[PDB]
Design a binder for this molecule. Sequence first.
Ligand SMILES: Nc1ncnc2c1ncn2[C@@H]1O[C@H](COP(=O)(O)OP(=O)(O)NP(=O)(O)O)[C@@H](O)[C@H]1O
Ligand SMILES: Nc1ncnc2c1ncn2[C@@H]1O[C@H](COP(=O)(O)OP(=O)(O)NP(=O)(O)O)[C@@H](O)[C@H]1O
Ligand SMILES: [Mg+2]
Lengths: 297, 311
Amino acid sequence: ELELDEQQRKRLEAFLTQKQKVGELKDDDFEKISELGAGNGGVVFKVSHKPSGLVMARKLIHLEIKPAIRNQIIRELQVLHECNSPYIVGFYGAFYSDGEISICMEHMDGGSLDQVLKKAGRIPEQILGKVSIAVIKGLTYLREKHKIMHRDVKPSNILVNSRGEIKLCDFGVTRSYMSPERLQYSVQSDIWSMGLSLVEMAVGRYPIPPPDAKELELMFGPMAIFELLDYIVNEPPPKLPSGVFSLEFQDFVNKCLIKNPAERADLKQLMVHAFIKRSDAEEVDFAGWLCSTIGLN
Amino acid sequence: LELDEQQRKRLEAFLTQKQKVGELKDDDFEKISELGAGNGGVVFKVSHKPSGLVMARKLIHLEIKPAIRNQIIRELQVLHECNSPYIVGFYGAFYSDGEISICMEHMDGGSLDQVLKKAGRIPEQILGKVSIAVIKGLTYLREKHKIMHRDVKPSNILVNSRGEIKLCDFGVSGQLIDDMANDFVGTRSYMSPERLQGTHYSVQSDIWSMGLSLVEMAVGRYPIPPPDAKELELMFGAIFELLDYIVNEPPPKLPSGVFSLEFQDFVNKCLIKNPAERADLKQLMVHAFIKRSDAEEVDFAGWLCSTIGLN
Ligand SMILES: Nc1ncnc2c1ncn2[C@@H]1O[C@H](COP(=O)(O)OP(=O)(O)NP(=O)(O)O)[C@@H](O)[C@H]1O
Ligand SMILES: Nc1ncnc2c1ncn2[C@@H]1O[C@H](COP(=O)(O)OP(=O)(O)NP(=O)(O)O)[C@@H](O)[C@H]1O
Ligand SMILES: [Mg+2]
């Protein structure tokens, strides 16, 4: 089930008023603090917005592209101001300046699960249960309520904080010889992304290709991206190894990782899976686990 | 689809010519002339001084942050070091002065869209032999998993005066688009196999491209807004409207009477709308049109030279 728990609506209103305290955003209303990390494209800084005194994360994507496409992006990014869930990172604004589109969002003191993974080795099953839930709720919210799909689920886009919230970020969107079958991915694709992320965090290794039992006991007791991209398409999906996880979890990742999208599980099929009902049951001191892992408190 | 003493000796003699380049530096090349253009870069015929080799050199003018640079070139080298008589030979890659330079065997015939301009139409027996080399070519990329980076169109089929026909160099665009869309440094992707087999080339979309290209070359025109009764009696005796027409209205086909049935069938098999129905390289490799082509003794080099003016 999914509808704002009283303590969650108490934080969403808490945000929305602070966001009302912000208004319009522009380069000089900002001072950097720290680099929070980067990836392919935008670097992400911890920043303070002096008009409001609020601490934000600022993604600085680099454009230098056609103004027609640019204004159009800024235009369609605005919809995010109506994207307000406990399972989505708090949105502030999005603007152009300097030849660089920037996206200002709620700073998360725990960073991405990708960084959490690097400190933890593995993320334990019951923590992953709470993650699973969050991204499911955030996909469903985005799907049913804004007909948006994420199209970029992965550990770096699952953010966590010391309040023990888990939120998605980076929602952000006469001669041709192409196939008709090409000239025309679902929420079903996003689910594969979830599943695979789940395995990675579970075993602490990106599971493609899988490992032979020689590198596995050193856990439980070198290819180019094009080889990879091909392997993903042609070879069977990865799985959790057996013994070390519950059957309910082993199965849950499997239904997310069926190669054929048509047979793969959907949000509603997953929202009631054994592993999730049990996960929703459990009380997990996620906050506790998170701070100790990374050093906060 | 394996055996020739000559095929093996020429590929061997290429590999021997290969390493005689050593390392390839910007200085080592004298631009002889220009050869053509795609959506990639511009290509020049060049002389390579350290070995006196004549080369095709494709320049890609995209800047790369010096950090990931050597990593992207290694990738591009692993990708491009094929060994097939159906794929143009690869000499090396490098990056000087904001520019990736793929260096290749020079195909003195140029591309088929070029040859098509000089011939107006390409005759059935020639297209038979092109058909073979393309099919052979895709198959070898299936059996090497390099397919996703390889489209087919008349500009990507090179020919030479020794009668050879080869698919060309990879669209480096696609490699770089992939590198940015995934974790390039960790070598990890989170994309579904649908989304991946959907945004890249595949054998079954290649076969559509081939058949489409075979029609173009055979009629002397891009055929997707089809020739009516008027033009298909003259010849013999909008931007988004195109991609709309491709998916909506029925496929193109060779005019009747003037092409053999074997040919007519073959393009049809290549051009069924549903990729699953549409034939693969194991069916096509034993289609009437291909067994006939493969048997025929065609003076392709003669024809090609005459068509474009060599010697
Ligand atoms: N709102 C935020 N609060 C705290 N840390 C963040 C926030 N957004 C991003 N980061 C950190 O910045 C890093 C880089 O983010 P990003 O530029 O999106 O790279 P990415 O996720 O690896 N690639 P992309 O596919 O563009 O999202 C992530 O690992 C996060 O840990
Ligand atoms: N090795 C070669 N020898 C002679 N001519 C060549 C050679 N390689 C390419 N050309 C010519 O130069 C053109 C270059 O475009 P091409 O190699 O197709 O670019 P691309 O980036 O590989 N693909 P596209 O950009 O989609 O055309 C070709 O159509 C040929 O006419
Ligand atoms: Mg991110």
